Amino acid sequence: YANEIIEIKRIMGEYNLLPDKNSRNGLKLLQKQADLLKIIMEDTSVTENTFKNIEIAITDIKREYYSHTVDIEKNIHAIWVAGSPPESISDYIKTFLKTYKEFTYYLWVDEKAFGAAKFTSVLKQIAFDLACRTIQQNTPQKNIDFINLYNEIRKKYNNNPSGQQEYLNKLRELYATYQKISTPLKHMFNSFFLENMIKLQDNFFNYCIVKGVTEINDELRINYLKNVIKLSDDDIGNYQKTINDNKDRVKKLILDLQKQFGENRISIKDVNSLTSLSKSENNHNYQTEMLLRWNYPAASDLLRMYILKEHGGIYTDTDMMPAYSKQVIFKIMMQTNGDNRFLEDLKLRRAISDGVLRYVNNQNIDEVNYNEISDADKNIIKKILTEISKMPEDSIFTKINTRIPRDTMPILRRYHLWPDGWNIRGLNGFMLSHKGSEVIDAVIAGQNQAYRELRRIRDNIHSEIYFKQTDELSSLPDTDKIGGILVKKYLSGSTLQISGPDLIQRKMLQFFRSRGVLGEEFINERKLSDKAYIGVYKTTGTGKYDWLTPESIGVNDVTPADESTWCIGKGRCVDDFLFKDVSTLKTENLPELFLTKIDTDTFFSQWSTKTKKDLQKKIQDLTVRYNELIDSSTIDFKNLYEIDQMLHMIMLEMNDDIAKRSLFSLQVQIAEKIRRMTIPVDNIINIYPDLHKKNDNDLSMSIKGFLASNPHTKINILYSNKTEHNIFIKDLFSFAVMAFFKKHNENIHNKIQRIKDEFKEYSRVAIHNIDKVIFKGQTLDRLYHEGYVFSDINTLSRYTLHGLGITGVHTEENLLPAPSSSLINILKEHYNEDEISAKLPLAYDYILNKKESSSIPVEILNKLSELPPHELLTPVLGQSVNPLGMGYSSDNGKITEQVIVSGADGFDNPISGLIYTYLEDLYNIHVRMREGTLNSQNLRQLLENSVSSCFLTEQSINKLLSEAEKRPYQSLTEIHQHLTGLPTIADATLSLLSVGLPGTGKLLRREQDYGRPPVTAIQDSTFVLPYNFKGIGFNDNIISSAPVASSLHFIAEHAKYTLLSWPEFYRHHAQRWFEMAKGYGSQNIDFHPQSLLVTQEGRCMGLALLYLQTEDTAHYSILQENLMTVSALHQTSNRDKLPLSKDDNSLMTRTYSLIEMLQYQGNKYITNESLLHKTAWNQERITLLFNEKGVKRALISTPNHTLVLQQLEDIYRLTDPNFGHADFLSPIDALKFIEAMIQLTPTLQEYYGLLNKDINKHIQVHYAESDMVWNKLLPENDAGLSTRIQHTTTDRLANLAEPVAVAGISLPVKTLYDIGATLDGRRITSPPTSEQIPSLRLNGDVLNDYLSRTVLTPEQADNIRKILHTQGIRSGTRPIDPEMIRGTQDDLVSSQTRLQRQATRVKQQLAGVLDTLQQHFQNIPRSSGRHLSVENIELADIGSGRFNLQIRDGETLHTTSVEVPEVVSRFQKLSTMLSALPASGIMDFDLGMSVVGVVQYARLLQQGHMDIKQLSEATLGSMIQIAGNKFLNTEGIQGFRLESAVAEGMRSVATRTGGTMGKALSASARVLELPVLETVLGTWNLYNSVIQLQQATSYSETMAARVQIAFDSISLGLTAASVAFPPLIIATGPIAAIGMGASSIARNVARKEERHTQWLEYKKFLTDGSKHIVVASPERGLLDFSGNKVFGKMVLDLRQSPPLLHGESSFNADRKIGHRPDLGDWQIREKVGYANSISPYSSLAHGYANSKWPRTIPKIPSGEYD
């Protein structure tokens, strides 16, 4: 306790050295003393004498602390409410003046807000009309009678301005009608009303910003009203009449009051003469309160706090009188003979108060209202008043104590005898305080926070509107209840309070709790004790309160004009309402509510002729670009900068005001768009710990919490060893001025090592040294080398590391994930809102660790242990920031730097470059300051070419120079503060951005003073500070607004598909998908499979939400094309491991970040029943929803997958991300197709998670009550995915028409990019200059991949070989043998293309086969060594692909079970085709090519011969050979070679089926027969030796590469060498095969078999003819139609850049009905009538009488064909 006693001594000694102990500093010192003494009490010492001594000392400190009391000022304050009658106020004012002789009465009057009631009423009318219109015209399911009646009575008023009381009565009746409306409609009404009123207030504040006004008066309000709507002179006359009436009433009342009493005794104080009114921290909340209030006859809650803070004294309402003296109560008790009914019930007390007030004011006592009072009570009250009237006027009332403790605000406490008992509570209608009290400041801050949280409904874009929160009197101003109260007040005209007594009590309790031990007497069971109030009555009787000797003297609040009598007795005035027909609304002047494009025909309507002639042409040049910027789904900052700069220039170059207002409306639209377009945040958290605390418990808790919150979140712990060394050196220098190195190094090393080994098993936690990744020329490196030690080094390091590409969240505090709604709900069972915050640390300790606390019930522990940790904590995923790039945490509305949330990788980050340049400038100023060489000239020169020059004012330069002279060595933050005057670098971000955004940035900065959130402030906080568990957001509460947990789909350890084998799933099911979609009536089926997510974790929610967002066919097509492009890019990047250009990588990262965020949001939304309705799969209910309930979108959720049903235009489109989309005319058809697709296919059913399950209870449909909800949840910033087509590098390079001269040959830039030409380690994105050409290198992997899928001409191969021989292969990539770069003639291009396609298919199938084999081998009880060795391979079942093998594990382990029906079926089909070929010359070229490639792969696997992976590959080869031998060796010859047999079969096929196909088959057979080529063997050996071993990729990729090598070796037989200068012209066309026509198959059809088998043969012929109508090779400019057989009357038009193909497809026909393509299978069956209507779909004839061959006309790729 040397860390307690010494500071106790010094704080005591400082307490002596206080000339005036009656001050806040003395109170703080005493608080510190008592806190340290209580900390000493917490020790384990058991000495009772010590306990007594310390408690006596604490009592002494408390007694000394309470000895400091302040005498309040002799001021009595009251607020005059507009429209108040002066007769009911003068009596109470006179009573208070008479009772308080030595007091000054001040009546606060706001002369500028006399007519604000009519302005507020007009705004409310506009807001309610807008809400009604939004409800009506967006609810097409049914009409609402309430809106119709509202419009009818408004139209009835439109003809009778004269009488309005009838209108208010009709509105009351209409509210009685409205009470019966449905609950969701009520919630929507409340939300829309509140949001519209807030938006109108924002519009008024924006108008104030335009006009540049400093104060707000009634003239400005009238001008704004004329701006928004049309005001006749009668409305202005009524406004002025009510203003004059209020002025005259106030003047007459004050004159009458000053005639009797003194002139200076009572006076009028102007409300506008208040400092707090113009304070920027108050956000002009006084003006907002005039609109969002429902207790209009009462006074302002903020104004009384302002008055008490700035002046001090007593505030009282104008309906209260001083408390009765002892004599009065005494006489009442004797006159009532001891009955307590006359001192407790409201009616008799009110009558007695009326009598006393009448008697004191020299009025008629007999005229007291004795209503609802019995006659005997009337007589006894009369005699009581008669006895009282004999008393002197100076003893009727008693004063109150004016001595209060320093920094305290006593609050009046009331006792009301309700029929159910007592209703003790505090009232803000009578308060006491002195000037400058701290508790008033705390209450004001609480009120500001309350208004901030109330504005959350409008400020938060992603705010849910269907959230029926329970009634709990929570601190959050529940928007639903407040909106309902406001609607009731607007309609009816007659609880919760954002700044009422409840908030005052809560803030006072918080202040007293933060006081410490001295505040313990103010706390009474976590509430406010009796010492915090006045008028407290002690209950001497069992329950009755002794009305004789109260603890404190209060005030008689039961008066004839109190809150309970003015509701009925005082009718609503007619001077606080102004009826206006909203139909004349000017929607172009309201950018906050209406998004209006600039229309040149009507934009310049009210402009002056001079301004029109000046700048109409200039503005008309902005219409297209401005509209594109407004309607875009992404932000292009260059266009935004240009448009904003020139709009600002035009604005500054004007003299008119209407045109200025229109341009400001455009700027406001720009600002709103900037606000609304948020971007995702990477799922990364970076913590910069302070290694000087010796307590890593908080850091470990933070790491554990962020680990448990999500299993994908990366955690980076970043520390600087150089900073620790500099700190140690500075400490050594200080110790010297005022062994060790080894000790400090060991200490730091052991701390870091402990942190590292605590989370060693977690790969997501990485501890990194900052100095290891820092550029040498960077500012941070120079600061490290200069011994920078200042505290802001960590903030500068955070900024630098973000600038280095480390995205995510950067913070220094030990942040903890915020609790989710489930955890708060669990804790709420036996806790209140004020105890959950204190109990949260225990729950967090029990969740992350496994510590059990005795202070928490075991039920809580049991309920928490049953839920996953990720369901109770909020992860970093799903967060978002402003489009500017960076976000900051807030503290009481001011942005801080505790948490920095920095965008997502791939998105534009304008703030990052500004911060980088600003830090460079600050470092330059620092180095100039250090050497004392900083004056004005070099200061201006340093920022001469810098954005930060905007801060160079004369006073800023003077301050910088003065501080440099005073202290040459200053921190960078201090330099920035001196230069700019802003507290933090975060504040300077908007100022820096305003240089490039002169108008929008200035407007956004100005709007901060009117309550709008800062543009760089994060609102939804997913983090909490460890010490208090308080959120770091702007307007959020972590307890009453906790986020909903997200449903995480648990996946298997092994996935069914990888990226290599993923297309097999689509290929196996695409035909069935199309057939069954067409059979159910779909007239448009489109295919666009996704290759982005190969694992069903997340259930494809992101893609489903992306497709659901689009509301049009054009946007749908754009999004589908963009998703296909991104899928291709992802396949190239990940499956092939090929480098990508910067733009393509950025696009992929943006798309993946959006997909992850959207999938998280969708999984969150589906599990929350309050947002989206959820129903089980029922076709009738879904049809009713889509037909009667006005539902246009829905999410069909299988346990593993998600589908989308939409209502684009008039069609109903169903989207399956894995396949594509098909649209139907009616919803029932789509639902039937969905159900059929789910049930019919077993593999698809198992993959989707519905295997052996009832789908009527395992399929859920998610929809919204209204279509607005989707617009609210789905983000607006789509990165341009659904509005514009994103072009890759190849697409842009294809537009260039100039070639590049490389190695003496000119080739296009696109071709150079395709072959992998890398410049300076990057793939070329632009035509390289002649200087950079010698530095060009060819990427081996890219070149190999290009050669894999390209059929070059011999000249192209020659050119590629020349380029390779001149430039070479980039080091570290795949070497390429020049002899492998060959070309083919025109007649073999189709064969080469089919061979390459077969190679791809075989690779994809063998990848899955190898994965299955590896899983089988891993399922074996292995011990050690190379024991796994297959002993025999044979296929027992030829019809199913079952192989039996034995393993020489050494323990005799045998598992003879593996299903490989892929290799077996290929050879089965080959044998069948070979045997049946002599009967009819029908063969499959693709099947033969695939068989040849597989055989060659096995043969290459033979030569050049042991872990599980290579064993599996060798086993696959062995099974290939075994299947080939079984299905090809008819006779058991020992000297049997599979290659020879396959070659002989191919030669037989080629001889019997001649032509170019026969030539290709002969070439492949010859390749198989001959020994492997030297080049092929060299390539195989080089790969297997160096390239596979060097890379760490999976074995599947290596196997696929080997298969590709084998297929390339097969492909070498179809190539030919170039011929130079051919002397003679030869024939270069393909040769037709024997049996092209349909007579060949018809010859075998004539064999007497089943008729349906003959039709199957005919259909096979038709499908083969339609499969290969066109083969396009735009690289060579070749079009191949030789495979066309069933596309008649073909017309090829090469005039257009994409050639047009037209023709007639072969079709099915029926004898009676003919060909009817427009009908589905069921309609065709009904027409023909060949079956029953209840027959299964499998019993029908699919494709009958409605089939076409080909299905659709093929599309020729764009190119130049010769």
Author numbering: 241 to 734, 751 to 994, 1119 to 1885, 1897 to 2153
Manuscript text:
Lymphostatin is a key virulence factor of enteropathogenic and enterohaemorrhagic Escherichia coli, playing roles in bacterial colonisation of the gut and in the inhibition of lymphocyte proliferation and proinflammatory responses. Here, we describe the structure of lymphostatin from enteropathogenic E. coli O127:H6, determined by electron cryo-microscopy at different pH values.
The C-terminal arm adopted two different conformations. Vice versa, conformation I had disappeared, which suggested that conformation I was a low-pH form and conformation III was a high-pH form. The rearrangement positioned the ART-domain at different locations relative to the N-terminus: In conformation I, the ART-domain was folded beneath the delivery domain. The C-terminal subdomain adopted two different orientations relative to the N-terminal subdomain.
